[PDB]
Design a protein around this ligand. Structure first.
Ligand SMILES: [Br-]
Ligand SMILES: [Br-]
Length: 188
């Protein structure tokens, strides 16, 4: 049971029974069935969502952190200062003209910021999420903050990554992710 797995890996994770009910059919439908497969998925889910407490991207950055995370977009402090402690301006600038988004003026960067326990980001990915799930998340992107579509989108995002991984074989912090995984892998 995913619910009792979410507890063994993160006894302090938020609402493991509500997420457990939603994650289980999303995992089963997207083929997240194998032993290690489930453990890694859950681990990635646990670190990206802050043990199920975060379903929207963190966009509060120091004037220093920005220069690191995005060194091209933020070359000097005169630049990185205007966008530090301004989550909307930050998203609109750093995500501008990327992953399907319009320019800074369009507001796409903030509109399509990361959402879900494992995050979907950018107009093109919401559009693709919309096509695959049949839910108008392009117009209503905050529907990925729900348990039901966050789980389905989290699971579809992991499924997409296995497709890529599989598709290449045919054509032949990070310690946090490790804790969960082995703590999860300990379960069978
Ligand atoms: Br809007
Ligand atoms: Br639109």
């Amino acid at each position: 049971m995913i619910t009792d797995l979410l507890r063994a890996v993160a006894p302090n994770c938020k609402d493991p029974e509500g997420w457990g009910e939603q994650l289980t059919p999303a995992m089963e439908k997207f083929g997240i069935r194998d032993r290690e497969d489930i453990a890694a998925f859950i681990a990635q889910l646990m670190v990206e969502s802050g043990e199920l407490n975060r379903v929207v991207e963190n966009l509060s950055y120091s004037t220093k952190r920005l220069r690191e995370v995005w060194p091209k977009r933020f070359p000097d402090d005169r630049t990185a200062m205007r966008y530090a402690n301004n989550p909307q301006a930050l998203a609109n600038y750093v995500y501008a003209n990327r992953i399907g988004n319009g320019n800074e003026a369009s507001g796409d960067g903030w509109r399509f910021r990361g959402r879900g326990p494992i995050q979907t980001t950018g107009r093109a990915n919401y559009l693709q999420l919309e096509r695959a799930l049949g839910i108008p998340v392009t117009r209503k992107p905050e529907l990925l903050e729900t348990q039901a579509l966050g789980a389905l989108a989290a699971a579809k995002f992991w499924y997409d990554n296995k497709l890529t991984s599989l598709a290449l074989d045919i054509a032949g912090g990070l310690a946090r992710r490790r804790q969960y995984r082995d703590k999860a892998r300990k379960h069978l």
